């Protein structure tokens, strides 16, 4: 008869444990152990413990956004909102960098990753400043078409 809890009531009874999704209402002392279920969106218990109460669900504050909602048995998870990424040592959300005109997306700006840009290579261009657009392949004007404007790394070719 092993005490899977390592905790005893005042008379040698192995305190019962509050399973997953349930916290400890009142600590086993004179009596057994009182467990009550946690509140969805409010409290969770991801541990089968006879000493742990329902902990307060983590809330996303500021530039932090819900990446995962809080269940009774699992805490919530928060990440930097769409337009930002999390700075490693600061833990602060910084706005994603933008690949300026004549520069294009290489690696998307997500969570711990800030936008990785690229100076458009030979044969491509980037019309705008943002962090979603990759350098595009130039339009090749037809032998019959008047190349009004040629392709540069910042503006695509024009024709008629």
């Amino acid at each position: 008869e092993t005490c899977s809890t390592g905790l005893y009531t005042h008379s040698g009874e192995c305190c019962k444990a509050c399973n997953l999704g349930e916290g400890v209402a009142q600590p086993c002392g004179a009596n057994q152990t009182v467990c009550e279920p946690c509140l969805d969106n409010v409290t969770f218990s991801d541990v089968v413990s006879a000493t742990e109460p329902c902990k307060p669900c983590t809330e996303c504050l500021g530039l932090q956004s819900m990446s995962a909602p809080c269940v009774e048995a699992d805490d919530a998870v928060c990440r930097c909102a769409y337009g930002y990424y999390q700075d490693e040592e600061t833990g602060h959300c910084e706005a994603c960098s933008v690949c300026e005109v004549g520069s294009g997306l290489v690696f998307s700006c997500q969570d711990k990753q800030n936008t990785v840009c690229e100076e458009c290579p030979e044969g491509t261009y980037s019309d705008e400043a943002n962090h979603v657009d990759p350098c595009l392949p130039c339009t090749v004007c037809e032998d019959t078409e008047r190349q009004l404007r040629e392709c540069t790394p910042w503006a695509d070719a024009e024709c008629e």
């Binding site: 509140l39 969106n41 909602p69 997306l105 690696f107 979603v132 990759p134 595009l136």
Partner: protein, 102 residues
């Protein structure tokens, strides 16, 4: 990676939905907390939409635009009469739709 999407989309967890169109195309009201066996849960939906068109598609042959597809989640919606559990439509992704041009 160094890989990119044809249609860009943005996804976010929505916790304050109030309206939606059901699996029968009928618009309807969506409630907040629900009661499933004496406990209350918040209704949350992971919603994904577009920003449109498509990127990388051969224009010299096909016409294309970005469209947001949807899944079906079971939720508590007030129709008018009583509250009932029905499947609502939830924007889940953005796909490029092709159409033979010229």
């Amino acid at each position: 990676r160094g890989e990119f999407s044809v249609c860009d989309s943005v996804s976010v967890w929505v916790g304050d939905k109030t309206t939606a169109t059901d699996i029968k195309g009928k618009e309807v009201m969506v409630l907040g907390e629900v009661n499933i066996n004496n406990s209350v849960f918040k209704q949350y939906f992971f919603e994904t939409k577009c920003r449109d068109g498509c990127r990388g598609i051969d224009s010299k042959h096909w016409n294309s635009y970005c469209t947001t597809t949807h899944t079906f989640v079971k939720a508590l919606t007030m129709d008018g009469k009583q509250a009932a559990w029905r499947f609502i439509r939830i924007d889940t992704a953005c796909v490029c739709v092709l159409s033979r041009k010229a």
